Design an enzyme around this catalytic site. Sequence first.
Site, PDB file in Angstrom:
ATOM      1  N   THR A  49       0.862  -1.177   0.133  1.00 29.90           N
ATOM      2  CA  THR A  49      -0.178  -0.012  -0.002  1.00 29.90           C
ATOM      3  C   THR A  49       0.956   1.211   0.042  1.00 29.90           C
ATOM      4  O   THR A  49       2.121   1.140   0.639  1.00 29.90           O
ATOM      5  CB  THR A  49      -1.058   0.137   1.438  1.00 29.90           C
ATOM      6  OG1 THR A  49      -0.077  -0.085   2.561  1.00 29.90           O
ATOM      7  CG2 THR A  49      -1.886  -0.905   1.211  1.00 29.90           C
ATOM      8  N   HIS A  85       7.618   0.385   4.006  1.00 30.75           N
ATOM      9  CA  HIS A  85       7.338  -0.871   4.678  1.00 30.75           C
ATOM     10  C   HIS A  85       8.621  -1.726   5.016  1.00 30.75           C
ATOM     11  O   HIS A  85       9.349  -1.559   4.618  1.00 30.75           O
ATOM     12  CB  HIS A  85       6.348  -1.712   3.553  1.00 30.75           C
ATOM     13  CG  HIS A  85       4.969  -1.058   3.447  1.00 30.75           C
ATOM     14  ND1 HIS A  85       4.107  -0.976   4.287  1.00 30.75           N
ATOM     15  CD2 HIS A  85       4.684  -0.508   2.239  1.00 30.75           C
ATOM     16  CE1 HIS A  85       3.190  -0.066   3.756  1.00 30.75           C
ATOM     17  NE2 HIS A  85       3.198  -0.111   2.577  1.00 30.75           N
ATOM     18  N   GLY A  86       7.955  -2.709   6.143  1.00 27.29           N
ATOM     19  CA  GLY A  86       9.132  -3.719   6.543  1.00 27.29           C
ATOM     20  C   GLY A  86       8.693  -4.863   7.173  1.00 27.29           C
ATOM     21  O   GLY A  86       7.177  -5.087   7.321  1.00 27.29           O
TER      22      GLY A  86
END
Lengths: 233, 4
Positions: free
Chosen positions: A29, A88-89
């Site tokens: 996203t 993100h991660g």
Amino acid sequence: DNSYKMDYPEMGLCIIINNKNFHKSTGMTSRSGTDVDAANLRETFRNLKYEVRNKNDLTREEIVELMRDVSKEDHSKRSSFVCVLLSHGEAGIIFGTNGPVDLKKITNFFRGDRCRSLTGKPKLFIIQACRGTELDCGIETHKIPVEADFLYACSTAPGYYSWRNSKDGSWFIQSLCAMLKQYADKLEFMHILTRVNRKVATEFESFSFDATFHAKKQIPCIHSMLTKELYFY
Amino acid sequence: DEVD
């Protein structure tokens, strides 16, 4: 001798990697609010006299290449090095726009034996990214090691999601910048980060129409392998 | 509020 030498001609580089939009095929996203973080960080580190470089929407390949290139610069006249990753991660991983990058791979470029102009100088990695999918429901009230002189200021506890507000920016980055603005001329960096821990832990709580994600809490984690105190003045 |  108890504090890092911070009066080299330059404070050093502050590399900010700001990943907002991800390739459709990854299914990741868009990270609304991250531009607020990147701007806040740019201003905050500008005021601390860092040479700030903002990079946006980098692929995994571009992240690795940028890090490698930066690690090969001559940092002899620089006191420190700062890298901020906004993406993100998951555990041990930060996402490029098109796929994952191993954090260890990135940080290895700056190991005491691999970036000699940063040997003995503080190397700070500030990370806003998830570290997993747990939610915190809270409770009502000669030689030196090649891994020495790194500090990882992680937005959230290992295994946990990290929270970002689409309007205000991430809880961690907004708190970090606020604490740096207020205390960088007064406090040692560990104490600044401890105040960030308190701010994130006490002042934020998620709001969601989805019960699974509602009323959740966050504690950042300081991972220090520093050998001296760090003052920005 | 969103997660990363």
